[PDB]
Write a protein that binds this DNA or RNA. Sequence first.
RNA 1: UAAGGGCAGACGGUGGAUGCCUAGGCUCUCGGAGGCGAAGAAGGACGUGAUAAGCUGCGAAAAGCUGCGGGAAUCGGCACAUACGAAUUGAUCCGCAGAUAUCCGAAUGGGGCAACCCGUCAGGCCCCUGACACAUGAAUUUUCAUGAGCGAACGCGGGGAACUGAAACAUCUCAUUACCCGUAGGAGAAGAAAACAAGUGAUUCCCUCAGUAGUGGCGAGCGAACGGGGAUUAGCCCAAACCGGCUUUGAGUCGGGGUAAUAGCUUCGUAGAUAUAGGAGAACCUACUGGAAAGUAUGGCCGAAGAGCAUGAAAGCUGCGUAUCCGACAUAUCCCUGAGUAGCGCGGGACACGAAUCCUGUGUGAAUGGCGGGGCCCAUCCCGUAAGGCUAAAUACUCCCGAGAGACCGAUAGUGAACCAGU
RNA 2: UGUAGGUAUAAGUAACGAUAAAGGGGGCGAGAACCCCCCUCGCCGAAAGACCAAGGAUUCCUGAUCAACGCUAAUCGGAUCAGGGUUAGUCGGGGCCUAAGGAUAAGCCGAAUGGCGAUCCGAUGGAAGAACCGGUUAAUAUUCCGGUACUGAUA
RNA 3: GAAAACCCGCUGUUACCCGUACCGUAAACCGACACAGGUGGUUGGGUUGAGUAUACUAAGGCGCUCG
Lengths: 48, 90, 63, 77, 102
Amino acid sequence: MKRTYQPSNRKRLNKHGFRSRMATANGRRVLAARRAKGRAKLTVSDEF
Amino acid sequence: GIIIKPIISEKMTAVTEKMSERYGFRVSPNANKIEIKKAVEAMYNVKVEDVNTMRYDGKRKNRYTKSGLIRGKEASFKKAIVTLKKGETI
Amino acid sequence: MKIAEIKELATKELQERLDAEVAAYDQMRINHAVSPLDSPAKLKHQRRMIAQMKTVLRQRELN
Amino acid sequence: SKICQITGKKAMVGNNVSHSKRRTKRVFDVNLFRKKFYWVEQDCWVVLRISAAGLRLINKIGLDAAIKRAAEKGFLN
Amino acid sequence: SKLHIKKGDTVMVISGEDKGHSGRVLEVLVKEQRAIVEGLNMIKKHAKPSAQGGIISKEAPIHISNLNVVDPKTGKATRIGRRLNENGKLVRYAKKSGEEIK
RNA sequence: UAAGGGCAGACGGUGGAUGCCUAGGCUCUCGGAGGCGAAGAAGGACGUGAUAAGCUGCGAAAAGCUGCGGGAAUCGGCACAUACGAAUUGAUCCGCAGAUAUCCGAAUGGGGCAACCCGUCAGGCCCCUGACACAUGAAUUUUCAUGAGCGAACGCGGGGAACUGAAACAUCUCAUUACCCGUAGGAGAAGAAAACAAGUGAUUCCCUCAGUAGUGGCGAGCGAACGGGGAUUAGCCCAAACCGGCUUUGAGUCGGGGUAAUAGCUUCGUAGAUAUAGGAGAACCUACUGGAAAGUAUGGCCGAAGAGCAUGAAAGCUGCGUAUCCGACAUAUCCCUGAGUAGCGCGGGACACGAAUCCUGUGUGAAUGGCGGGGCCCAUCCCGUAAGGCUAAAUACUCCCGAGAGACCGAUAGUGAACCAGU
RNA sequence: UGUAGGUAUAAGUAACGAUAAAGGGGGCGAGAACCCCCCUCGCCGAAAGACCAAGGAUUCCUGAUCAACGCUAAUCGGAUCAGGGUUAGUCGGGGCCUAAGGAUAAGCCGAAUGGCGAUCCGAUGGAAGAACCGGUUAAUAUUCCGGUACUGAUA
RNA sequence: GAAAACCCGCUGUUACCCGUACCGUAAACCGACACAGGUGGUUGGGUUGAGUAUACUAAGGCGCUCG
Ligand SMILES: [K+]
Ligand SMILES: [K+]
Ligand SMILES: [K+]
Ligand SMILES: [K+]
Ligand SMILES: [K+]
Ligand SMILES: [K+]
Ligand SMILES: [K+]
Ligand SMILES: [K+]
Ligand SMILES: [K+]
Ligand SMILES: [Mg+2]
Ligand SMILES: [Mg+2]
Ligand SMILES: [Mg+2]
Ligand SMILES: [Mg+2]
Ligand SMILES: [Mg+2]
Ligand SMILES: [Mg+2]
Ligand SMILES: [Mg+2]
Ligand SMILES: [Mg+2]
Ligand SMILES: [Mg+2]
Ligand SMILES: [Mg+2]
Ligand SMILES: [Mg+2]
Ligand SMILES: [Mg+2]
Ligand SMILES: [Mg+2]
Ligand SMILES: [Mg+2]
Ligand SMILES: [Mg+2]
Ligand SMILES: [Mg+2]
Ligand SMILES: [Mg+2]
Ligand SMILES: [Mg+2]
Ligand SMILES: [Mg+2]
Ligand SMILES: [Mg+2]
Ligand SMILES: [Mg+2]
Ligand SMILES: [Mg+2]
Ligand SMILES: [Mg+2]
Ligand SMILES: [Mg+2]
Ligand SMILES: [Mg+2]
Ligand SMILES: [Mg+2]
Ligand SMILES: [Mg+2]
Ligand SMILES: [Mg+2]
Ligand code: NA
Ligand code: NA
Ligand code: NA
Ligand code: NA
């Protein structure tokens, strides 16, 4: 049975990466909210 | 000072007992072969023939405190196997 | 060497001593890893002295 | 950013009001168009996006004076 | 804050199990405000064999508020103040006799 | 006979309640300050230690470098450590001023999957390196300053719901709220009568007027102003007539800076202080109990000091302190009179007001004592002088810094977080 | 059918995850059905053998340990701690080129935030210059060593 | 029944960067599990057969972590 999560690093960074968040105004809104909450990880670019 | 420390180990001892013109250094991860070569010439006054390099990432480790557990990492480094000209040692 | 002695240099012998001390510190750093030194505080001393020399050279160049 | 370059008029927000006093949001739009004008003072042709009220002001006080007044009022740019 | 005792001074224990005993200050632990007085507050420490082990007798620190500087006139464990007698330099003097402590 | 079981007591186990405790919260008061950033921010990555770094600090000069002032014996940050060194020739530590400050990020040489890849031109080394420059938009004249991004609340502006209430619901309400977006300052906005009124005299804020006048499927609801009492108190500057100079254009029309002067009535002919380190700073013995006195009992002493915290139990006289007095090498702070105007028609909006006042999408359109207002419209009367602008104070708020407080909490409480917590 | 923590009951019960299968002799050990060596047996064999990529990220090798983890025990382990280990001019990728699509220039549209719009970016495609036989580790090999070569710049 | 780059006629000194361990029809990936599932491409000996079907079996790997 195929499950919902099928990993792909290129797709992950294209969809949720730091540059894609910075591209639009609402992505920068998301980044500002996460910084205000104080999250240790800001985007999926942080994980390794 | 890109060179950090020499490599003392069984593999290095075996290769030096075999060839005797080969020496292993641990250097900064961003130093390429030309600068590793110039640096060893400066630090030891020898002529260098060839350089082989490989990048190592740090080992992941488990720091143990009184309450629980923390996840940490060691620093990354670069290995540099150095071949001197036939006739010289370190 | 001390702060007063370093400040009592001539900005050319000081530079020559700067490169000499840098090379010496690299040699001691390489040697201490192979053989653990009896008094490793010489490394801290040499590092601080290099920082002091660069500070004095920057002071002389800027003013 | 469709604004009359001579008068500064822009679209207004108001209501459609039915007979039963139902109120629905609406826009009152400017009677805006692009027109080519002969500027006599510089002997040139200039295309202006203006309203009919701006055209009335131009026909009243001349095109050069209207352009200068609009520039001093900040409408022209 | 500067302390009322220092290493190399002779002090007297004014409170505790060693009340009324004088000794020499060996080390001062400024962070926890305790000092080691020679020969006083002995403890028996059990040590495993390492660099034969055994039962070592040693000195345990005393809180500095339980120590007073000995008067160099009668040894009565006075209080001290500070003044500028020595050419204007701040020095410690005893309050019971007025003599400086050197 | 008790295989087992029931009840009680004693003693255990498990579990972590309760009591006692805590600087970790909560709510405020007073005084400051109200931004950081292209000289590269907020926030991150990667490094950096004698011994791996999880935090902290710092940046290839990397738990750190220099000078001046303070100060006097230990110090080399923390997660229960040893070594090895530094230091009275004055370390460590504190105040002020400096040096260095990798990579990403508005990111700005071009790209990019953030912390990476690839370049050009001038030099210097020597295929490879370290050090320069190389973005874009607006004033501006290619030299120059300014801007971009982030960030608590408070301000102003552009858009703008619905659940709900009306015991259904559509006018109405919720509400010019939530939310989205743009943009300032230490405050902002407003402000000097084409005003209220039936004498007062610019704005703003507080108490009243008053749940009144009004408004409203006259339902649910909404809801002033005048006047009075206070806080604070402040008024000015242009355009034109007019007088000169210059350029341009066809004696004369413009456009420039200068003078002249703007109205309920005119005009023209401060350094000492404070702050950011510091210095001094009174006065206790004996006995008892106790593991240990600060407790008890005697007996003394200080008090411009009987706040507090620590010390082997509860201390005015043990320590740090407290009352009081003293102290800074720098560095900061203190004739003319506003025209697509007034007014008007159509459709809408804001005003307490669901059609007098004010605003305008659309179409029109004057006057130069005139004009406007006093709740439909006319006349008399009264008040004012639109179509130009600026302006402190009294008012709103707290990310932050300093000093304090509580008939506020005490670890399932109090912040989600007293600890490894936005983990 | 309230919330957190702790502890019960059902109960020493269900179950211990493909019916491909095991027996014996030695070793080490305090302790062995299960660990190591040998003999015999059985299962797969267009695989349940051998490789490339995605994805994972030290699980790889060695020495200590058997607390927790492993559906039993364990002297064993993909478990804990420490040490070690990945070597390229020729392999793969990237540096070069463009597709879908994306971001933009000149311009266009639009309360704001913004939406469009041909050069640039963008592989899953095109171009890539260029070998090998033998040895060799506990763990790497077309990468290290010895022989035979090739290919591109530069003086 | 792509495009563009590109390609045609118009004797020394050298050789830079990243990956390379290990799993990978799986106990190491996606399924909370040492889970009877899912996961693109290559190779895949002998006898039998039309066959890469089927049965047996080399090389190699296993007997599926309670008896
Ligand atoms: K080589
Ligand atoms: K390599
Ligand atoms: K203002
Ligand atoms: K005192
Ligand atoms: K005491
Ligand atoms: K006291
Ligand atoms: K129920
Ligand atoms: K072993
Ligand atoms: K297989
Ligand atoms: Mg491990
Ligand atoms: Mg009990
Ligand atoms: Mg430097
Ligand atoms: Mg000093
Ligand atoms: Mg760029
Ligand atoms: Mg209703
Ligand atoms: Mg007694
Ligand atoms: Mg007690
Ligand atoms: Mg809590
Ligand atoms: Mg039930
Ligand atoms: Mg049963
Ligand atoms: Mg089951
Ligand atoms: Mg069963
Ligand atoms: Mg991978
Ligand atoms: Mg293994
Ligand atoms: Mg077990
Ligand atoms: Mg292991
Ligand atoms: Mg291209
Ligand atoms: Mg490809
Ligand atoms: Mg292998
Ligand atoms: Mg091209
Ligand atoms: Mg391999
Ligand atoms: Mg494999
Ligand atoms: Mg499986
Ligand atoms: Mg299994
Ligand atoms: Mg095939
Ligand atoms: Mg076959
Ligand atoms: Mg078959
Ligand atoms: Na019984
Ligand atoms: Na750049
Ligand atoms: Na003092
Ligand atoms: Na594979």
